[PDB]
Amino acid sequence: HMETLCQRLNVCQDKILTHYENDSTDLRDHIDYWKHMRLECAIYYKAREMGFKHINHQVVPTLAVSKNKALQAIELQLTLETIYNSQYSNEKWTLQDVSLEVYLTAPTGCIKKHGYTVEVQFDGDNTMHYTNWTHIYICEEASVTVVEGQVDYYGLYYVHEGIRTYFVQFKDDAEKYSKNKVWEVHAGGQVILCPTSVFS
Amino acid sequence: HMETLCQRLNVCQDKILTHYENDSTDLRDHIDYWKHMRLECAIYYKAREMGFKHINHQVVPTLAVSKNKALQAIELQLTLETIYNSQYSNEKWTLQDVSLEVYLTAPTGCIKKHGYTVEVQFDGDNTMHYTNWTHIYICEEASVTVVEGQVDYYGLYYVHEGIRTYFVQFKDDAEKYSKNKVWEVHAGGQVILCPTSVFS
């Protein structure tokens, strides 16, 4: 075991680093990376179950940490596999496109690409920065549809199957930071001003 | 599309039939089968989305049917992949071992093998038949442990991580069929009789 776990982790961790070095744009390679990310969790989970506090002088996480990371790896592996079976399969996909960091940025649980900043001024440049995305992949059990990140006076949203879904509502930050609920949105084009009447 | 979906389904369905013909005992092949089962759902889902009521004169299911089947294929694909990364990977695994029929038999959500009948007589041979399993694979996010199906006066159970879990409780059938709550369990060895006092 000791040896067996060490050798398995070493092989697993070498594959992960090789993916990092190569920086491929082929979706197939990203699938294999996330499968290795998932396998690493199974190795640490077993090491922890066996009572090891380190493997090769590297900390072995608690079981709950390894379970949670394997769930994250699974979500990414599955998503990429659904994309692999769709019409979007042959696009360019970068490692950062398929990273957990992107995946969890609003809108959470979605691979996304071609991100850019939208800035909201809550009175004169409290000024917040938010990421919008031209390509948002909505993956379900047997399908995927790419939608575009759109920008409102009210926030950032997409429209999927007819349904407009806001993933950022600018009023949330305004009520947390500012005194007035009136702002100006800059997103790479005409500033967006409040479209309704403003009062006393 | 029409052509594209037809050709994809034809290729997908030929692979599924080839797995059926070959009858392998290698876990790797069962992984590939369930990936094709999942892909078939994505093809039918797209066909239905596109308004086709049949593809090649075969009925296209409603979307909800294809979504539900892809979830089932995913659960089996993931399970087999967790087994592939464990110490049980090189055992024999049959197509029936990895079938949805087995997977959903109590205890549900578990690949299992080496099943046999236990018979319970609710007074003199209402006589019920239940399947018990010598090998039950409890798969979680980053691990799998094989447990054995065990037999009680009370039912069928396994013990996982110290916790005894009944997957069949014989009192459920007795209260649904019989007048007295006293039975005799036959499971391939000594009959099991009621172990407590019986009353007026």
Swiss-Prot record, chains A, B:
Modification(s) after translation: Phosphorylated. Sumoylation plays a regulatory role in E2 transcriptional activity.
Region of interest (Transactivation domain), ranges: 2-199
Main location, first listed in the record: host cell
One example of a Gene Ontology biological process annotation: DNA replication
Localization terms from the record: Host nucleus
GO annotation, cellular component aspect: host cell nucleus; host cytoskeleton
GO molecular function terms noted in the UniProt entry: DNA binding; DNA-binding transcription factor activity; nucleotide binding
Record's keyword annotation contains Disulfide bond: no
Keyword terms of this UniProt record: Activator, DNA replication, DNA-binding, Early protein, Host nucleus, Isopeptide bond, Phosphoprotein, Repressor, Transcription, Transcription regulation, Ubl conjugation
rRNA processing as UniProt keyword: no
Tree of life domain: Viruses
Miscellaneous comment in the UniProt entry for this protein: HPV16, in comparison to HPV types 6 and 11, is more often associated with malignant genital cancers in humans. Part of the antigens expressed and presented within HPV-positive head and neck tumors.
Family according to the record: Belongs to the papillomaviridae E2 protein family.
Function: Plays a role in the initiation of viral DNA replication. A dimer of E2 interacts with a dimer of E1 in order to improve specificity of E1 DNA binding activity. Once the complex recognizes and binds DNA at specific sites, the E2 dimer is removed from DNA. E2 also regulates viral transcription through binding to the E2RE response element (5'-ACCNNNNNNGGT-3') present in multiple copies in the regulatory regions of the viral genome. Activates or represses transcription depending on E2RE's position with regards to proximal promoter elements including the TATA-box.
Subunit structure: Binds DNA as homodimer. Interacts with protein E1; this interaction greatly increases E1 DNA-binding activity. Interacts with protein L1; this interaction enhances E2-dependent replication and transcription activation. Interacts with protein L2; this interaction inhibits E2 transcriptional activity but not DNA replication function E2. Interacts with protein E7; this interaction inhibits E7 oncogenic activity. Interacts with host TAF1; this interaction modulates E2-dependent transcriptional regulation. Interacts with host BRD4; this interaction mediates E2 transcriptional activation function.
Name of protein: Regulatory protein E2
